[PDB]
């Protein structure tokens, strides 16, 4: 809410100032198993999926 | 014990900044005479030298002359210090509450009238006037006029009653061309702002202010009152942005205050000036204005009978400074809409303030959603059910939505008294009888002076003072009180019973004698069948019992009247008081019991199994003699003076002495 | 903007010593609270009577 739009603007960004919308966050996921014999050994990768 | 203190409370009961207080002239001088003294210019001059003294003496005279101007204005300046009444209204009017002019004697009638034309619907147009003689005096009727239009269905058999309610006076309507620069006065005395209604050209506007005031009308329709200091009312309405402000609901916005006028909106107002407060209790009515084709065949008093009622209502003084003075502060305190219990007290006090000497707003914690009200019709103790309904709905206008107003006249302690008052014949040339007519005023004077106000402890003797004070040719005055309550059910005590709040002598608890229908048969030559026998009984207290208790002894019973049960026996005690009957019937039962210390009184006729209907009368009056001098009141139980409606409760013996 | 415009808004005497009397005569009546019934909806429909 707030801002009037109206025939107004070329700019994409001034509107992006707030589209409303939503922002970033982190989350922690699951425990881990070692591939072999130690977990400190193993390393992580996550592609988005 | 009593009140210990740390430097407590504040500045007496009420502010007196008291630099303002008018002092005694000599002291004023005495103060001022010091003032000139010590004046650096001269420390020499002796003031008690009579030469300067009278000279300074004069300064104080003006200084006192001028002060009461300066001081009184302050009393004036501050409401509740205001000594002038037309002052008081102003701040009160300013506070959003006004006292009103004498408020027309009002009533309702239903009248059965045949239309000669036999049209489906006749209206009674607003403004037909009827006559009512004041009580007991037919020398003149008091005119009173149809409040409003009303129509009636023609019943079959062709006769049908309309009903309508009636306020006293004459409709008086005056058109005025409104103009920018001008006061709009009505110089009419006997006017009352509550019966004032008006028309701008066409539509009616309401002074928001206790006419409607919540409706879609958008507030553009409106106006005010005011009291000219003269005693006559002037009209007023808001000018320019007459609605709250600006654009509001209109898309075009701009500005409208209305009433340009140029000639626009020629203002026509319609009102009733009245003779009221003199007209209360006007029973006999006339149909005092004819209409086309309508003929009243009967006008029958008081639909939906109380049954105890009087003719009309209302009137009013109008003015009392005391009830008015503090009061508007609560309305100054409260908003328009009434919220607080005392807000419902004061709000009710506005409209029907002349109907109500005192109104008691309270909750009954049992029933929520109901505003429980105990008021004084101030003509009598019982507002006729329409009034109750009337103000209710009107009251109900200002209220919380789920809340409902509930008005009941509370129970009333009655002081039943024979008076013994002596006077010297010679000492009074004045007509003896009229003296009684004198005292009988001064009796309620005390009441109105005292008792209804707080409904506090009641002093018999202190009452007898003013009646003592009456003729001063009265040589002596004596009286004896019987504390009296009224009971709604002879059959079953109210659950809680009944309490006196006041210690009574044992065995001094009495009641009224009343017949009882007994199934047993009576026949007398020429009488024939004769239904059955009925005899009378009354409620009797037995003696005090240890632990201050007593059992309620029923009136005497003939044999075979009451089926004897192994449980219930003729009480047949020695003590209990007994009426003297020709029957000599000695059967007496305990119908219930009491205790004197708690003053609480219970019985049930279900106990004796005797049928309610074999009693003729539903209510009985209660007799008791409080052992104590003065009568204590608590809640909803108030001693009061109504002689006219209930003279048997008030009696006076007159002792002629040479 | 909408196609309705003037360079600026705001101004005023402010007082208009008479005109204010009403306003004072009014606001003394006003409530920020809502009570009865029709007090609400008014104040209510002040919001989204558009809805």
UniProtKB/Swiss-Prot annotation, chain A:
It comes from the Viruses. It is found in: Virion. Intermediate/inner baseplate protein. The gp25-(gp6)2-gp7 module is involved in sheath contraction. Involved in the tail assembly. Belongs to the T4likevirus baseplate wedge protein gp7 family. Heterotrimer with gp6; assembles as a (gp6)2-gp7 heterotrimeric molecule. The (gp6)2-gp7 heterotrimeric molecule further interacts with gp25 and gp53. The gp25-(gp6)2-gp7 module is involved in sheath contraction. Interacts with gp8. Binds to gp10 homotrimer; disulfide-linked. Heteromultimer with gp10; a gp10 molecule is disulfide-linked to gp7 and the other two remaining gp10 molecules form a disulfide bond. This is Baseplate wedge protein gp7. It comes from Enterobacteria phage T4. The chain holds residues 149 to 197 of 1032 of the full protein.
UniProtKB/Swiss-Prot annotation, chain C:
It comes from the Viruses. It is found in: Virion. Induction: Expressed in the late phase of the viral replicative cycle. Coiled coil: none annotated. Homodimer; each gp6 molecule in the ring interacts with its two neighbors, forming an N-terminal dimer with one and a C-terminal dimer with the other. Heterotrimer with gp7; gp6 is part of a (gp6)2-gp7 heterotrimeric molecule. The (gp6)2-gp7 heterotrimeric molecule further interacts with gp25 and gp53; the gp25-(gp6)2-gp7 module is involved in sheath contraction. Belongs to the T4likevirus baseplate wedge protein gp6 family. Baseplate protein that is located next to the tail tube (inner baseplate). Involved in the tail assembly. The gp25-(gp6)2-gp7 module is involved in sheath contraction. This is Baseplate wedge protein gp6. It comes from Enterobacteria phage T4.
